C-alpha cells in the first residue's frame, strides 16, 4: 500500500 | 498541481464537537491517500494525531478521530478542550509525494483551563516543567540569530566607507 | 518516551551549506523511516522527502532534490539533512518526523536563517552616524524580544507549578 518504511 | 484545502479557521467552545475537513483538488480523498492530521502549538511544536485516515497516534486522547466524509478526510474532536486551541494540518499521499493542506486555526472559547494537569503525576508535571527550559532557550537563540542578520548589512555599510 | 531532538538554529549567508541533525530515542532507529519537512515563515508545510533507515534509500520531493540531501549515522540514531548552496528562500524551520504512514512523531524544529543583506542597498547611502544609530537601536529591540520570551515562559511554568503544589 503505502511505500514508505512503516 | 494537486492542492489540499482545509478551512482557514474555526471556533468552538468547551465540550462541543467540531469537524475539520481536508479536500483534494484531484477528486475524492480515499484510503490510498493515507490522510494525516497533525497539530501545531507555539512555538512550532508539532505532534501527530492521526495517520492512515483513522489511526490515532499512541498517546493522543480518544476525543480525536479521523475518517472520510463525503469525499474529504475529516478530523472530529468530540468534546473540545481549551488545550485543543492550535493549528491543525492535514497531509495526503499522492502515489509518490506528500502534500500538506494550509492548516486550520482552531479557536477554543473559554480562556485557559488547567484542570487536566490535576490528573498528572508529580513526576510528569516536573518533566513538563523542565522541558520548557530548552524550548525557551531555543526561542531566545532564534531571536539572537534574527538580529545577527539585521546587524550585518549595517556593519558592512560602516566598514565599506 | 519516543523523542526526536534536532540541532539548534543556524544562521548562514547565501551560497553556504548547513547540516541539521535529528537524534532519535525510544524506539529501534532502523525500523521506521525518517521524513523531513520545511515550514517557511508564516506559510504551510512542504514535504522534503524520507530516508529508509533500514536500507539507507531516500525518496525526495522534486523541488528539493537538487540541493537537499539526507544521510544517516545509524550507530548514533541520527538522521541528517544537508542543504547546500543556500538561497534566501531556504529560510524556514525544518522538521524531522518519523513514519508512519506519514508523520507520527515530530522533532522540535530547526530554524535556518539565510541572511539576505537586502538592506545594504539603501544603507550604503547613509552617513556613518545614521548607520551607528540604527545599529545601536537594534539592541533594545532584541533585548525586549528576549525578555518577552522569558516572561511568556514564566507564565507557562506557573500553572504547572501550581498543579505540583496542590498535590
Ligand atoms: Cl544613537
Short précis:
The complex is a heterotrimer of chains A (about 5), B (about 160) and C (about 170). Chain B is of the alpha+beta class.
Distance between the termini of chain A: 11 Å
What Rg of chain A is obtained from the alpha carbons, in whole angstroms?
5 Å
CATH fold-level name of the domain at 1-112 in chain B: Immunoglobulin-like
- What is the subunit organization of this protein? heterotrimer
The shape of chain A is elongated
SSE arrangement of chain B, N to C: EEEEEEEEEEEH
Q: How many E strands of chain A? A: 0
Using the 3D structure, state the CATH architecture of the domain at 1-112 in chain B.
Answer: Sandwich
* Main sheet summary of chain B: 7 strands, mixed
Percentage beta strand of chain A:
under 5%
Helices of chain A, by number, come to: 0
Total number of helical segments of chain B? 1
Q: Count the strands of chain B?
A: 11
Structural class estimated from helices and strands of chain B = alpha+beta
Roughly what percent helix of chain B? 10-25%
Helix-residue proportion of chain A: under 10%
Describe this structure in words.
The complex is a heterotrimer of chains A (6), B (161) and C (167). Chain A has 6 residues and is mostly loops. Chain A is 0% helix and 0% strand. Chain A has no helix or strand. The radius of gyration of chain A is 5 Å and the shape is elongated. The N and C termini of chain A lie close together (11 Å). With 161 residues, chain B is α+β, with helices and mostly antiparallel strands. Helix content of chain B is 24%, strand content 37%. Chain B has one helix at residues 122-159; strands at 4-6, 9-12, 17-24, 36-41, 45-51, 55-56, 64-69, 72-78, 86-93, 98-100, 104-108. In chain B, the strands form 2 sheets. In chain B, strands 2, 4, 5, 6, 9, 10 and 11 form a 7-stranded mixed sheet that branches. Chain C has helices at 120-123, 128-165; strands at residues 3-6, 10-12, 18-25, 34-39, 45-51, 58-60, 68-73, 78-83, 92-98, 105-106, 110-114. In chain C, a hairpin with a 5-residue loop joins β4 (34-39) and β5. The chains are: A little secondary structure (6), B alpha+beta (161), C alpha+beta (167). Chains in contact: A-B, A-C, B-C. The complex binds chloride ion.
Amino acid at each position: 500500500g503505502y511505500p514508505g518504511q512503516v | 498541481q494537486t492542492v489540499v484545502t482545509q478551512e482557514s479557521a474555526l471556533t468552538t467552545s468547551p465540550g462541543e464537537t467540531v469537524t475539520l475537513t481536508c479536500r483534494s483538488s484531484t477528486g475524492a480523498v480515499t484510503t490510498s491517500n493515507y490522510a494525516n492530521w497533525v497539530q501545531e502549538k507555539p512555538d512550532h511544536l508539532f505532534t501527530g494525531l492521526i495517520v492512515g485516515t483513522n489511526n490515532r497516534v499512541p498517546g493522543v486522547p480518544p476525543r480525536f478521530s479521523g475518517s472520510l466524509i463525503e469525499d474529504k478526510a475529516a478530523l472530529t474532536i468530540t468534546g473540545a478542550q481549551t488545550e485543543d486551541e492550535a493549528i491543525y494540518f492535514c497531509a495526503l499521499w499522492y502515489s509518490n509525494h506528500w502534500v500538506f493542506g494550509g492548516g486550520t486555526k482552531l479557536t477554543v472559547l473559554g480562556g485557559s483551563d488547567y484542570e487536566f494537569l490535576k490528573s498528572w503525576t508529580v513526576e510528569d508535571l516536573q518533566k513538563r516543567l523542565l522541558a520548557l527550559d530548552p524550548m525557551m532557550e531555543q526561542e531566545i537563540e532564534e531571536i539572537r540569530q534574527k538580529y545577527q542578520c539585521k546587524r550585518q548589512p549595517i556593519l558592512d555599510a560602516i566598514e565599506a566607507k | 518516551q519516543i523523542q526526536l531532538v534536532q540541532s539548534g538554529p543556524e544562521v548562514q549567508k547565501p551560497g553556504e551549506t548547513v547540516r541539521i541533525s535529528c537524534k532519535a530515542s525510544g524506539y529501534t532507529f532502523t525500523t521506521a523511516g525518517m521524513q523531513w519537512v520545511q515550514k517557511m515563515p508564516g506559510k504551510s508545510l512542504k514535504w522534503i522527502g524520507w530516508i529508509n533507515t533500514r536500507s539507507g534509500v531516500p525518496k525526495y520531493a522534486e523541488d528539493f532534490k537538487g540541493r537537499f540531501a539526507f544521510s544517516l549515522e545509524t550507530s548514533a540514531s541520527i538522521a541528517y539533512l544537508h542543504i547546500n548552496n543556500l538561497k534566501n528562500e531556504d529560510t524556514a524551520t525544518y522538521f524531522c518526523a518519523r513514519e508512519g504512514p506519514g508523520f507520527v512523531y515530530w522533532g522540535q524544529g530547526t530554524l535556518v536563517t539565510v541572511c539576505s543583506g537586502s538592506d545594504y542597498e539603501f544603507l550604503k547611502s547613509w552617513t556613518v552616524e545614521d548607520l551607528q544609530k540604527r545599529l545601536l537601536a537594534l539592541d533594545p529591540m532584541m533585548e525586549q524580544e528576549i525578555e518577552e520570551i522569558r516572561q511568556k515562559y514564566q507564565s507557562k511554568r506557573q500553572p504547572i507549578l501550581d498543579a505540583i503544589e496542590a498535590k
